[PDB]
Amino acid sequence: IQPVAAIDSNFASFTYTPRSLPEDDTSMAILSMLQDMNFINNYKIDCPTLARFCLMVKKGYRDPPYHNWMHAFSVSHFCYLLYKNLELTNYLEDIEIFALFISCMCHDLDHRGTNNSGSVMERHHFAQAIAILNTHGCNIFDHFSRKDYQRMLDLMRDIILATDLAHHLRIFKDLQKMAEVGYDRNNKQHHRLLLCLLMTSCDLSDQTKGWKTTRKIAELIYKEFFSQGDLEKAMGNRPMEMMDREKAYIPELQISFMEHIAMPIYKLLQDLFPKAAELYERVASNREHWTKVSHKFTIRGLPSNNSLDFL
Amino acid sequence: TKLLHDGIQPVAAIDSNFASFTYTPRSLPEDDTSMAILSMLQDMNFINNYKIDCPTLARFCLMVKKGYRDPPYHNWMHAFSVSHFCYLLYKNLELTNYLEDIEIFALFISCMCHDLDHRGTNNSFQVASKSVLAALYSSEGSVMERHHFAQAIAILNTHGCNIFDHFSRKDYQRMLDLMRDIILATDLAHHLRIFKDLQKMAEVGYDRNNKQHHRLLLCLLMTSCDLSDQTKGWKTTRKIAELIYKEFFSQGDLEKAMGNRPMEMMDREKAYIPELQISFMEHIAMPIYKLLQDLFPKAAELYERVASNREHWTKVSHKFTIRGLPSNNSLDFL
Ligand SMILES: COC[C@@H](NC(=O)N1CC(=O)Nc2cc(OC)cnc21)c1ccc(OC(F)(F)F)c(F)c1
Ligand SMILES: COC[C@@H](NC(=O)N1CC(=O)Nc2cc(OC)cnc21)c1ccc(OC(F)(F)F)c(F)c1
Ligand SMILES: [Mg+2]
Ligand SMILES: [Mg+2]
Ligand SMILES: [Zn+2]
Ligand SMILES: [Zn+2]
C-alpha cells in the first residue's frame, strides 16, 4: 500500500483532479486513502479481503460515458478530500465517515447510462453492493459486531439512497434549517442530514474543479442522456427535452443544473464548513463560464460539413 | 466538333419550360450549356440579325466557357445561368420595346463574359494580395470587372473567335462600349452610385428617347441577371448561398494568413449566415427586383419570389443554433 504523498504531492488538495490518475492505479489509490484515514487499522480490515472487495466494486461498474468506475473513484476521492480538509471527525462518528467512503465507491454500481424513468437505480446500486459483500472473500465487515455490521448496512443504504435527486429535494428544507441554526454534534438527525449533504457534494464534485473538468463531464453526461433518448425514440416513446439531441439546448440545461442543483448544495456546505467556501466559489465561477461560452452554440460560418443541406 | 456536328437545337427541344421564369438553368448538364447558348441566340434572332458566322460563334462560346475557372460559385455555370436569365427577360419582358437590338445583344454577350477568369476573390482582395490584376487596375477601381472585360477583348482578338469582325466600324465600337459599361455595372460599388438615378427613372417612368435611361436600364438588367439565383426556388438560393460563403471564407482564410483582418462576412469564425443573407436580400437583391417591377409589371413574380426566399431565410434562422452536441460529438470547441 503506497503512502498517499507518493501518488501525487497535491493528492489531498481540492485542486487535484482524480481523473488525471490512470485507471490502473485507482484501486491502489483507494487502498492508500483508506490507509491514510486510518480505517484499515481502526476496524481491523483484512487487507486481502479489502483488495478483493475494491477490485469487485471496480469490476461492477459498466462503461457508459459518465457512470463508470472513474466516476465512482472521483466521488470517493472527494470524500477523502472532505475528510482531510474539513476535519469531518469533529462532526461525524468514524463509522459514519467510513460508511460514506464505501458508499461513494458503490453508489452507482451497475449503472447502464440510463435514469430511473421510488429510487429504482439507487436501490439496485445498494443491492449490488450487498451482493459484492456476500461474495466469498469480499466481506470487509465479516468481523464486525452484529451491532456495527447492521449500522454499516443501514448507513450505506441511507447514503446511497441520498444520491437520488428526488431524495435531496425532499430533505432540502431540513438541510437549510440545519445550516441556519448550526450543526449540533449531539443531534442524530443532523448526522443523517449531513451524511446526505456530503454524499451529494461528492457526487457533484466534478463541478468544483477547473473549467476543463466541467466541460468534459458535461459532454459525457449529455452523451448518456442522448443515447437514452435515442433508445426511447426507437421504442416509439417520446423522450424528455433534455434527453432529445434534436431539442436539448445545452447552455440552458447546464446553467439550470448549476443554479438550481449544484450551487445550493455547495452553498449549504459552505454555511456548515467555512473551509468549503473555495468549493462554492469554483462552482459559481464554472457557472459564469457556461454563460460566457453560451454564444458558441450558434453556428458561425458554415458547419464542419461545409454544407447547408441540414436546412 | 460536338457543338458544330450537333446542329443548333430549337429551344423548345431543350426543355418545354426553357423560356419560363420557373426554369432553373443549373439543371442543364454542363456539356449541353454551349449548345443552349447558341439556341438562345438563335431564338432571339441575333444570329440572322447581325449575320454572325456560326463557326466563329461556336468557337467564341467555347473560348468563353474555357475562360472560367472552377471556384465554388464564380464558374461557367454561373455565367450560363446569368445569360439564361437575360434570355428570359427578352422573352418575358419584351425588351425590344425599351432597348435597341444592339443593346440587348451586348447585354447577353456581356452576361456570358462578365466574370471571366474569376478566382473566387473580390476587388479588395486583389489590392490586399498585391496581385497582378491590382497592379494593372487598382488606381482605376472595379479591378475584377476591368479584368473580366479585358479577358473578353482578348477572346475576341483570338483567331477565329471575333463574332463582330463583320460589324460596321460604328457598330463594332458601340458593341465594345456597351460590353465595357455593362460589365463594369456588375461591381456593387457601381450599382450603389447609380441607385438614386435608377429610382428617379422608375418613378418618372422609362423614356425610350432618353439615352441616359437606356444606360441605366442596361445596368439594372445586368445586376438583375447577376442576382437571378434569388428569383428561383428555395433549393437554388440555399445552394447558391452555400457556394458564395465557401468562396468568402476561403478568401478570409487567405487574408488571415497574410496578417490582415478580414471583413466579418469573410470570417468563418464571426460570420452568422442568416443575418448576412437577410441583409444581402433586404438591402441589395429586393430593391433591384422592386425597381425591375416598377419598370416592368410582368417582373412582379420575380420580386415576389425574392421576397418569399427572404421570408424562408428568416424561418430557418433558428437552425443555426446547435441543439444537442455538435456532429463532432464533442464539447472541445468551448
Ligand atoms: C443523471 O444525473 C447525474 C448527475 N448529474 C450531473 O452530475 N450533471 C452534471 C452536468 O455537468 N450536467 C448535468 C445536467 C443535468 O440535466 C440538465 C443533470 N445532471 C448533470 C446527478 C447525480 C445526482 C444528483 O442528485 C443530487 F444532486 F441530489 F446529488 C443530481 F442531481 C445529478
Ligand atoms: C461577390 O458577390 C457576388 C454576388 N453575390 C451574391 O450573389 N450573393 C448571393 C447570396 O446568396 N448571398 C450573398 C451575400 C452577400 O453578402 C453577405 C453578398 N452577395 C451574395 C454579387 C454580385 C454582384 C453584385 O452587385 C450587384 F448587385 F450590384 F449586381 C452583388 F451585390 C453581389
Ligand atoms: Mg446515481
Ligand atoms: Mg462579377
Ligand atoms: Zn454518481
Ligand atoms: Zn456574376
Q: Is A296 exposed, middle or buried (0-12, 13-18, 19+ CB in 10 A)?
A: middle
CB B80 within 8 A of CB B37: yes
Produce one character per residue of A129-155: b if its CB has 16 or more CB atoms within 10 Å, e if not: beebbeeeebbbbeebeeeeeebbbeb
- Quote the cell numbers at residue A92: 461525524
Give binding residues of B for Zn(2+) as ranges: 78, 114-115, 226
DSSP 8-state class, residue B44: T
Q: Could you tell me which residues come within 8 angstroms of residue A12 by beta carbon, excluding any fewer than 6 positions away?
A: A4, A36, A80, A81, A84, A85
Q: What is the Å distance from ligand 1's center to A261 Cα?
A: 8
DSSP 8-state class, residue B268: T
- Quote the cell numbers at residue A298: 450558434
How many residues comprise chain B?
A: 334
Ligand 1 close to Cβ of residue A168 (< 6 A) = yes
Q: What is the largest CA-CA distance in chain B?
A: 69
Residue nearest to atom 9 of ligand 1 (CA): A218
**CA dist., res. A286 & res. A25, Å (int):** 28
Three-class SS of residue B323? coil
Ligand 2 close to Cβ of residue B191 (< 6 A) = yes
- Domain A1-311 listed as CATH 3.10.20.340: no
How many residues comprise chain A?
A: 311
Please report where in the chains the cell 452555400 appears, as a residue: B242
**CA dist., res. B284 & res. B265, Å (int):** 15
**CA dist., res. A283 & res. A281, Å (int):** 6
DSSP 8-state class, residue B284: I
DSSP 8-state class, residue B61: H
Domain residue limits, chain B? 1-334
**CA dist., res. B149 & res. B151, Å (int):** 5
- Contact list in B for residue A297 (CB cut-off 8 A) is 321-322
Partnered with residue A298 across adjacent β-strands are B321
Residue of chain B minimizing CA distance to A216: B331
**CA dist., res. A131 & res. A288, Å (int):** 43
**CA dist., res. A241 & res. A253, Å (int):** 10
**Closest by CA position to A196, among listed A174, A170, A163:** A163
**CA dist., res. B282 & res. B266, Å (int):** 19
Between the two ends of chain A, the Cα-to-Cα distance in Å is: 59
Interface of A with B in 209-248 (CB under 8 A): 215-216, 218-219, 222-223, 226, 244-248
The amino acid at residue B309 is: N
The amino acid at residue A23 is: E
Superfamily of domain B1-334: 3'5'-cyclic nucleotide phosphodiesterase, catalytic domain (1.10.1300.10)
Number of Cβ within 10 Å of residue A173's Cβ equals 9
Q: What phi, psi does A249 have (nearest 5°)?
A: -110, 105
Q: Which of A246, A293, A303 sits opposite B324 (nearest CB)?
A: A246
**CA dist., res. B203 & res. A109, Å (int):** 79
Task: Tell whether A203 is in a known binding site.
Answer: yes
CB A276 within 8 A of CB A269: yes
CB B178 within 8 A of CB B218: yes
Helix axes of A146-161 and A188-203: crossing angle, nearest 10 degrees = 50
Please report where in the chains the cell 449531539 appears, as a residue: A186
- Chosen from B331, B332, B333 to mutate, greatest number of chain A CBs within 10 A: B331
Partnered with residue B321 across adjacent β-strands are A298
B139 interfacial to chain A (CB closer than 8 Å):
no
Q: Residue A13 — left, alpha, or beta (φ > 0 → left; ψ -120 to 50 → alpha)?
A: beta
- Quote the cell numbers at residue A172: 432540502
To one decimal, the resolution in angstroms is 2.2
Ligand 2 close to Cβ of residue B243 (< 6 A) = no
**Closest by CA position to A114, among listed A236, A259, A253, A228:** A228
Residue nearest to atom 26 of ligand 1 (CA): A165
Number of Cβ within 10 Å of residue A294's Cβ equals 16
**CA dist., res. A98 & res. A101, Å (int):** 5
CB B307 within 8 A of CB B288: no
**CA dist., res. A171 & res. A34, Å (int):** 29
Please report where in the chains the cell 447577376 appears, as a residue: B226
Q: Which active-site residues of B does the annotation give?
A: 74
- Inspect the interface and report whether the beta carbons of B331 and A219 lie closer than 8 Å: yes
Partnered with residue B272 across adjacent β-strands are none
What is the gyration radius of the CA atoms in chain B, in angstroms? Answer: 21
The Cα angle at residue B177 between residues B172 and B180, in degrees rounded to 5: 125
CB B25 within 8 A of CB B88: no
A295 interfacial to chain B (CB closer than 8 Å):
no
**CA dist., res. A68 & res. A109, Å (int):** 8
Ligand 1 close to Cβ of residue A171 (< 6 A) = no
Number of Cβ within 10 Å of residue A253's Cβ equals 17
The amino acid at residue B300 is: A
CB A8 within 8 A of CB A29: no
Experimental method: X-ray
Number of Cβ within 10 Å of residue A213's Cβ equals 20
3-state DSSP of chain A: CCCHHHCCCCCCCCCCCHHHCCHHHHHHHHHHHHHHCCHHHHCCCCHHHHHHHHHHHHHCCCCCCCCCHHHHHHHHHHHHHHHHHHCHHHCCCHHHHHHHHHHHHHCCCCCCCCCCCCCHHHHHHHHHHHHHHCCCCCCCCCCCCHHHHHHHHHHHHHHHHCCCHHHHHHHHHHHHHHHHHCCCCCCHHHHHHHHHHHHHHHHCHHHHCCHHHHHHHHHHHHHHHHHHHHHHHHCCCCCCHHHCCCCCCHHHHHHHHHHHHHHHHHHHHHHHCHHHHHHHHHHHHHHHHHHHHHHHHECCCCCCCCCCCCC
Residue B146: which H helix or E strand, with range? helix B143-156
CB B256 within 8 A of CB B262: yes
Q: Is B94 exposed, middle or buried (0-12, 13-18, 19+ CB in 10 A)?
A: exposed
- Inspect the interface and report whether the beta carbons of A300 and B328 lie closer than 8 Å: no
CB A12 within 8 A of CB A81: yes
Three-class SS of residue B321? strand
